[PDB]
Amino acid sequence: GVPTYGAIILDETLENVLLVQGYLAKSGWGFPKGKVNKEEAPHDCAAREVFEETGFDIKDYICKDDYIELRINDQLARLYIIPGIPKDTKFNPKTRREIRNIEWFSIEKLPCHRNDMTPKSKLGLAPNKFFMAIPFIRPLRDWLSRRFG
Ligand SMILES: COCc1nc(C(=O)NCc2ccc(F)cc2)no1
C-alpha cells in the first residue's frame, strides 16, 4: 500500500480538530491526507495534501517528531499534529471536485470506535460518518495528555 500523509489540525483551545468530507468512496469525514508521490519527503506530502484539501499551509508549523502513525490494512498513514490554528481561519479546497466540506469538530464528541449492532443480534459495525477519523481519536487524546496535560 502506498503510504499517506496529512495533518491533525487543532485550534487554540485544543478542543476541536479540522476534518474534511469528500465524495463517493470518501463521502464521510476524515483528516486531510493523501498518497505520497515518488521521491517526495513525508513532511512535503503532508503539506501538499493538506494545502490541496483545505487551502491552509502547514509547512511553517510542522514539527518533525509530532505525528500519529497508523498501519491500517498494511497501509501506513501518518498525520502530523498541528495545534493552535485559529478557529476563524478561512479554509478553501483547491479542488471542490474532491472536497465537499471542511469543518471543526469537538474532539470530546467524536467517537473513538464504531458501535456494534448487538441490539439487532447482527455481527459487524453500524455505519459512522467519522469512520476514517475514528482510528486516530484515542491515540490523539493520549498524545495531547502526554504533550500538554
Ligand atoms: C469506508 O472507507 C472509505 C472512506 N474514506 C473516507 C475519507 O477518506 N474521507 C475523508 C477524506 C480525506 C481526504 C479527501 F481528499 C477526501 C475525503 N470516507 O470513507
- The closest alpha carbon to 48, from 80, 11, 87, 89, belongs to 80
| Atom 5 (ligand 1) nearest CA | 26
Tell me how far apart the terminal alpha carbons of the chain are, to the nearest angstrom: 35
Longest dimension (CA), the chain: 50
CA distance 76 to 67: 12
* In the chain, where the domains are located: 1-149
Which residues does 148 contact at the CB level (< 8 Å), separation at least 6? 14
- The closest alpha carbon to 104, from 12, 37, 35, belongs to 12
CA distance 85 to 113: 26
Cα dihedral 94, 140, 78, 72, rounded to 10, equals -110
| Atom 18 (ligand 1) nearest CA | 26
Ligand 1 center–CA 98 separation, angstroms = 10
What is the number of alpha carbons within 13 Å of residue 78 lying toward its C-beta?
A: 18
Q: What's the reported resolution, in angstroms, to a tenth?
A: 1.8
Compute the Cα dihedral for 102, 107, 57, 53 and give only its sign: negative
Q: Which CATH number fits domain 1-149: 3.20.20.70, 3.40.1280.10, 3.90.79.10, 3.90.180.10?
A: 3.90.79.10
Residue with cell 472536497: 99
How was this one solved?
X-ray
Q: Is 131 in the pocket of ligand 1 (CB under 6 A)?
A: yes
Which residues does 25 contact at the CB level (< 8 Å), separation at least 6? none
